[PDB]
Ligand binder design. Structure first.
Ligand SMILES: C[n+]1cn([C@@H]2O[C@H](COP(=O)(O)OP(=O)(O)OP(=O)(O)OC[C@H]3O[C@@H](n4cnc5c(N)ncnc54)[C@H](O)[C@@H]3O)[C@@H](O)[C@H]2O)c2nc(N)[nH]c(=O)c21
Ligand SMILES: C[S@@+](CC[C@H](N)C(=O)[O-])C[C@H]1O[C@@H](n2cnc3c(N)ncnc32)[C@H](O)[C@@H]1O
Ligand SMILES: [Zn+2]
Ligand SMILES: [Zn+2]
Lengths: 290, 120
């Protein structure tokens, strides 16, 4: 059971190339839960496994790395995911987090309210979203959702550094055509499902190294159908075995350079570096509530 | 949630919390316990987890009474000593991390807990 020792499952190209109708998601182990290693919140394991998978991706990791974490609070008033991000990221990374409801966290900056009130003055390097709207549980047909996805799509288009990356939680019913289409503007993308929460239709839609141009033309409604087909076709065991050895958990200190360039100057070499996780393009000079 | 509202009807939150749990009151729950390689230095407060084999590491804001109760911090600098960092707790005190922190102080020269690591 080698997959049980991985942090989770990533959507394979076998399913990305399919062409199927959107069906109901039916997981054999639906809503089963696994006990957690200790007095330890389940979201500790979920975020650690997302981070472990991102350790295998070509993330840009500069000094003073700019990370924004939406949907960071909880009904307990604490932020387990933000603390995991603090454990994972470089010590000099800046974490900004946000939630509709009040909470306390280990971020550098914590903003309360709708994510639309979060003004990102400068481009950022990494966006993590765990936002989910309770009304999504009141299910007619399963259509693409607006909600906070309109904001995130606009963020990707305007406030994300070239070379930057995103991990955005989706579910069977919480998803966006436009966000899937925007994954085609990254060097690579997938949907990643943690083993700690394998019994849920949750996945993290991953856009790795933003290029600002269309590399893959994705039909977003069809691609969600492919995601559901994949989940319906793929046994996944609940597991946290990947968290037994944490000696290499922390994000590698890559020292990725940050350059400012005009669009006319972005040539084949620069695109190659961006696509390999070896460069960010953005200012090197402010996230607040509007 | 009982004890959180209690520490808002008093001028001495540290004593009010400690008197409450010393009298059998339930410790504050939902401190953010991390998973760590128990291979750290063992200091009290650190930028990354530092639990040894005999400690657990918590996210710092979650074990700070002042952070958790959303009340004014006592530090004259106005800056919390835990928030944004990690706090190591002896493994035998994990029933009440907030109370452990209120009850103890890092050594000013070696930064290990006095009585729980400080060899000075
Ligand atoms: C995948 N799935 C969905 N449904 C049905 O469709 C509805 C909506 O489906 P969903 O899109 O919510 O997906 P799923 O149920 O897998 O989401 P889940 O509850 O696991 O939530 C995943 C993450 O969303 C966040 N979340 C969920 N609910 C909330 C909430 N109310 N508030 C804040 N966050 C939430 C949490 O982080 C949670 O871990 C389900 O409530 C259920 O009736 C299923 N039914 C069966 N019988 N078998 C299934 O496999 C199945
Ligand atoms: C699964 S919970 C987050 C759990 C948290 N990530 C953790 O580490 O435990 C989903 C969060 O999304 C937040 N959310 C939903 N819609 C939002 C929005 N439009 N703007 C900001 N936060 C939102 C909710 O308030 C809720 O706290
Ligand atoms: Zn505090
Ligand atoms: Zn000492």
């Amino acid at each position: 059971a080698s997959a049980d020792w991985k942090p989770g499952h990533a959507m394979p190209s076998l399913f990305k190339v399919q062409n199927v109708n959107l069906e109901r998601c039916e997981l054999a182990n639906y809503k089963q839960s696994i006990p957690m290693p200790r007095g330890v919140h389940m979201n500790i394991a979920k975020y650690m496994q997302l981070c472990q998978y991102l350790n295998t991706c070509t993330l840009a990791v500069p000094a003073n790395m700019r990370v924004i974490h939406f949907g960071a609070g909880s009904d307990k008033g604490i932020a387990p995911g933000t603390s995991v991000l603090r454990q994972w990221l470089p010590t000099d990374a800046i974490i900004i987090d946000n939630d509709l409801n009040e909470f306390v966290s280990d971020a550098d900056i914590t903003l309360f309210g709708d994510c639309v009130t979060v003004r990102v003055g400068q481009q950022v390097d990494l966006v993590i979203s765990d936002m989910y709207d309770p009304t999504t549980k009141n299910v007619g047909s399963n259509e693409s959702k607006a909600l906070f996805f309109t904001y995130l799509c606009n963020l990707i288009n305007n406030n994300l550094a070239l070379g930057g990356s995103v991990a955005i939680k989706i579910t069977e019913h919480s998803w966006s055509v436009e966000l899937y289409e925007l994954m085609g503007k990254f060097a690579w993308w997938t949907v990643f499902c943690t083993n700690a929460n394998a019994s849920s239709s949750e996945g993290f839609l991953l856009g790795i190294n933003y290029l600002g141009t269309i590399k893959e033309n994705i039909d977003g409604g069809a691609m969600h159908a492919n995601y559901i087909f994949w989940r319906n076709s793929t046994p996944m065991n609940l597991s946290t075995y990947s968290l037994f050895d944490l000696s290499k958990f922390q994000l590698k200190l890559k020292g990725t350079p940050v350059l400012q360039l005009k669009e006319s100057q972005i040539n084949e070499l620069v695109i190659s570096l961006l696509s390999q996780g070896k460069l960010l393009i953005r200012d090197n000079d402010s996230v607040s509530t509007d | 949630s009982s004890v959180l509202s209690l520490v808002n009807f008093t001028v001495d939150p540290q004593k009010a919390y400690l008197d409450f749990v010393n009298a059998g009151g339930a410790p504050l729950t939902n401190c953010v316990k991390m998973l760590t390689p128990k291979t750290g230095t063992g200091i009290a407060i650190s930028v990354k987890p530092e639990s040894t084999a005999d400690q657990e590491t918590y996210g710092g804001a979650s074990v700070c009474l002042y952070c958790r109760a959303h009340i004014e911090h006592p530090d004259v600098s106005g800056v919390c000593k835990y928030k944004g960092k990690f706090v190591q707790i002896p493994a035998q005190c994990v029933r009440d991390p907030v109370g452990f922190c209120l009850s103890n102080t890092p050594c000013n020269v070696c930064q290990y807990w006095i009585g729980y690591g400080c060899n000075c």
